[PDB]
Amino acid sequence: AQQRTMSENLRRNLAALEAKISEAKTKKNMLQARAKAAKANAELQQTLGGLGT
Amino acid sequence: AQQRTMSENLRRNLAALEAKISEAKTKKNMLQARAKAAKANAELQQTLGGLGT
Ligand SMILES: Nc1ncnc2c1ncn2[C@@H]1O[C@H](COP(=O)(O)OP(=O)(O)O)[C@@H](O)[C@H]1O
Numbered sequence: 001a002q003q004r005t006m007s008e009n010l011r012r013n014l015a016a017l018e019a020k021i022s023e024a025k026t027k028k029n030m031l032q033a034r035a036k037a038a039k040a041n042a043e044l045q046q047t048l049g050g051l052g053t
Numbered sequence: 054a055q056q057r058t059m060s061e062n063l064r065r066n067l068a069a070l071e072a073k074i075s076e077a078k079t080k081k082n083m084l085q086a087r088a089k090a091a092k093a094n095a096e097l098q099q100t101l102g103g104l105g106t
């Protein structure tokens with residue numbers, strides 16, 4: 001009984017941990033995409049911006 | 054739902070970026086052509102211009 005309720009609580013902690021890491025991975029990739037989008041936008045702002053070389 | 058609307062906005066940004074780059078490429082080539090036309094015109098202005106060697 002002690003091992004089963006211990007293991008159950010630990011399993012709950014494992015599930016929570018995994019869910020949070022899955023979230024973090026999703027958020028990390030969309031930030032990479034938005035960063036790359038910003039970089040692309042900057043290069044167009046440069047070439048098609050004002051005057052210069 | 055969050056991933057789909059995020060991805061949709063990012064896809065819109067990608068489409069806009071690509072359209073602007075396609076435009077830039079078109080404009081770049083017609084400028085190369087007009088530059089080369091000007092250079093050709095200059096060589097005729099030289100040979101068939103005034104006096105000299
Ligand atoms: N004569 C110019 N006109 C506009 N931009 C220039 C010029 N010369 C250089 N730049 C470059 O283009 C960028 C224009 O600044 P930015 O804030 O993007 O323009 P805006 O304030 O109109 O959005 C600057 O970072 C600068 O490095």
Ligand SMILES: Nc1ncnc2c1ncn2[C@@H]1O[C@H](COP(=O)(O)OP(=O)(O)O)[C@@H](O)[C@H]1O
Pocket residue numbers: 098099102103104105
């Ligand atoms: N005697 C000359 N008459 C005309 N052009 C000359 C003469 N000697 C040299 N050139 C060259 O030909 C060019 C004539 O100048 P340009 O402004 O093209 O003529 P226009 O003002 O009649 O259009 C000059 O760049 C110059 O280098």
